[PDB]
A paper describes a structure:
The HCMV Pentamer, composed of gH, gL, UL128, UL130, and UL131A, enhances entry into epithelial, endothelial, and myeloid cells by interacting with the cell surface receptor neuropilin 2 (NRP2). The other critical tropism-determining complex is the HCMV Pentamer, which is composed of glycoproteins UL128, UL130, and UL131A and the same gH and gL proteins that comprise the bulk of the HCMV Trimer. This elongated heteropentamer mediates tropism for endothelial and epithelial cells by binding to neuropilin 2 (NRP2) and triggering the viral fusion protein, gB, to facilitate entry into host cells. HCMV-directed antibodies isolated from asymptomatic donors predominantly target the Pentamer, suggesting that Pentamer-specific antibodies may restrict viral dissemination, making Pentamer a target for the development of vaccines and immunotherapeutics.
Model building was facilitated by high-resolution crystal structures of unbound Fabs (1-103: 1.9 Å, 1-32: 2.1 Å, 2-18: 2.8 Å, and 2-25: 2.5 Å), which were then used as reference restraints and lightly refined as a part of the complex. The epitopes of Fabs 2-18 and 2-25 overlap substantially with each other, with both Fabs binding to the junction between ULs 128 and 131A. This junction where UL128 meets UL131A does not fit into one of the preexisting antigenic sites, but rather overlaps with both sites 2 and 5 of IR1 (16, 38), thus representing a previously undescribed neutralizing epitope. Intriguingly, we observed a substantial decrease in the neutralization potency of 2-25 Fab, as compared to 2-25 immunoglobulin G (IgG). The similarity in epitopes between these two mAbs implies that the decrease in 2-25 Fab potency can be attributed to the lower affinity of 2-25 compared to 2-18, suggesting that 2-25 requires the avidity effects of bivalency to neutralize effectively. However, 2-18 and 2-25 were not susceptible to the same loss of potency, suggesting that they may neutralize via a mechanism distinct from that of 1-103 and 1-32. As expected based on the results of our NRP2 competition assay, the two most potently neutralizing mAbs that we examined, 2-18 and 2-25, do not appear to compete with NRP2 a1a2b1b2 based on our structural analysis. Because the dimerization interface is formed by two copies of UL128, it is likely that the binding of 2-18 and 2-25 would prevent dimerization from taking place while still allowing NRP2 engagement to occur.
Residue numbers in the entry:
A (entry chain A): 1 to 52, 52A, 53 to 82, 82A, 82B, 82C, 83 to 100, 100A, ...
B (entry chain B): 1 to 9, 11 to 106, 106A, 107 to 210
Write the structure that this text describes.
């Protein structure tokens, strides 16, 4: 079917530039325009511009002050968006979407991509400190002060899955992330069942196994 | 530039009819489209050219454009229709999305939050740090507000709180952290995490002397 696939998540410093691609499949790339739309955390969708994949002409939102360049590669079925002089307001999810035609008739988008995230921050890679949240039942792990996203948390090397809720991370004023994982367990199990949370932060190559005791 | 203004929120029970409006200048001369965006998903086109429906979109979505107001009507709303809804139109070579409307469908009965407050671990305190962790679980609807108290005064520094997220039973959980120094933690009689859900406040309290 018609599908749009954006490239992977990016982590950038303020002032840098980022190039996101959108790979199109399931239709004739050359007959449609591709839109770029962004969404900052918790905010409205924001149109950035479009390119007619056939002719190559473009239209840009004037809000971006000529910081946006949209291009396409017809043999690759790929549209590109380059955002230069990144600043923290550019940290957002970036969607590509296909126009109903070439951006000049009914003015609606019929197919959307999955979106990709661009993080913009002056923070440097930092591994987390992992602390136990001892029971007294609910117990858990606090994964504190890391950058960038993400960390993954399993329990007992993945053996324990029911009653586990790993929260989305918070971004603190310091620029560093923090999250926690919790398990609700039966009070009987404490002191006989072993509970170990496994924290992996691939950008810093941090692996920590923490046993959570009463 | 051109602006498309939407009400920020609509709350509805399953079966009721939701109406989302979108106002814009000369909207009557424009084609309006509507996109549905469920939590953590890409937008989906539900209405285009004011009132047309794409294939696969439920027929309970309908649209109208009259008197410079586009209106998205969801008849007999279902729980799965909970989403953000965006209006979209075109003006001066610019595609414009509306401000967006959060549509809440009260699908479950009201459930008050369970609150669990963890003090700083001794391991954290030995690393010269201290974080209180407040877990808020099993509540519905998904909206909650967190307030921290040190003794009885409101805490306005060091607080971060996650946006609620569904558990595996379709109730919501939330998380809140109060970052302190160990000296600040150890020099107060008590700290409390106060969770307000539908006008009713749940509280938990911890102390350095426990």
């Amino acid at each position: 079917q018609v599908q749009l696939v954006e490239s992977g998540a990016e982590v950038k410093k303020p002032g840098a530039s980022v190039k996101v691609s959108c790979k199109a499949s399931g239709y004739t790339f050359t007959n449609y325009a591709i839109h770029w739309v962004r969404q900052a955390p918790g905010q409205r969708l924001e149109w950035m511009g479009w390119i007619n994949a056939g002719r190559g002409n473009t239209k840009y939102s004037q809000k971006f002050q000529g910081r946006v360049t949209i291009t396409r590669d017809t043999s690759a079925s790929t549209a590109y968006m380059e955002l230069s002089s990144l600043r923290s307001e550019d940290a957002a999810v970036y969607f590509c979407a296909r126009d109903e035609s070439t951006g000049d008739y009914y003015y609606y988008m019929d197919v959307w991509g999955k979106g990709t995230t661009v993080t913009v921050s002056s923070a440097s890679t930092k591994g987390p400190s992992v602390f136990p949240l001892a029971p007294s039942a609910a117990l858990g792990c606090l994964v504190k002060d890391y950058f960038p996203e993400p960390v993954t948390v399993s329990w007992n090397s993945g053996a324990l899955t029911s009653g586990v809720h790993t929260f989305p991370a918070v971004l603190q004023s310091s620029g560093l992330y923090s999250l926690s994982s919790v398990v609700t367990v039966p009070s009987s199990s404490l002191g006989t069942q072993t509970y170990i949370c496994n924290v992996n932060h691939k950008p810093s190559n941090t692996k920590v196994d923490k046993k959570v005791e009463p | 530039s051109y602006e498309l203004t939407q009400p920020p929120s609509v709350s509805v029970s399953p079966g009721q009819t939701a109406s989302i409006t979108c106002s814009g200048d000369r909207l009557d001369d424009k084609y309006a489209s509507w996109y549905q965006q469920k939590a953590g998903q890409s937008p989906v086109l539900v209405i285009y050219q004011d009132n047309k429906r794409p294939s696969g979109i439920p027929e309970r979505f309908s649209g109208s454009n009259s008197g410079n107001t586009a209106t998205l009507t969801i008849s007999g709303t279902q729980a799965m229709d909970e989403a953000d809804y965006y209006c979209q139109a075109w003006d001066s070579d610019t595609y414009v999305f509306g401000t967006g409307t959060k549509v809440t469908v009260l699908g479950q009965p009201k459930a008050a939050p369970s609150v669990t407050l963890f003090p700083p671990s001794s391991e954290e305190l030995q690393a010269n740090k201290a974080t209180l962790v407040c877990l808020i679980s099993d509540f519905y609807p998904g909206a909650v507000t967190v307030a921290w108290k040190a003794d009885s005064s409101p805490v306005k520094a060091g607080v971060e709180t996650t946006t609620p997220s569904k558990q595996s039973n379709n109730k919501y959980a939330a998380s809140s952290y109060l970052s302190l120094t160990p000296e600040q933690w150890k020099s107060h009689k008590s700290y409390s995490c106060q969770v307000t859900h539908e006008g009713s406040t749940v509280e938990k309290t911890v102390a350095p002397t426990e």
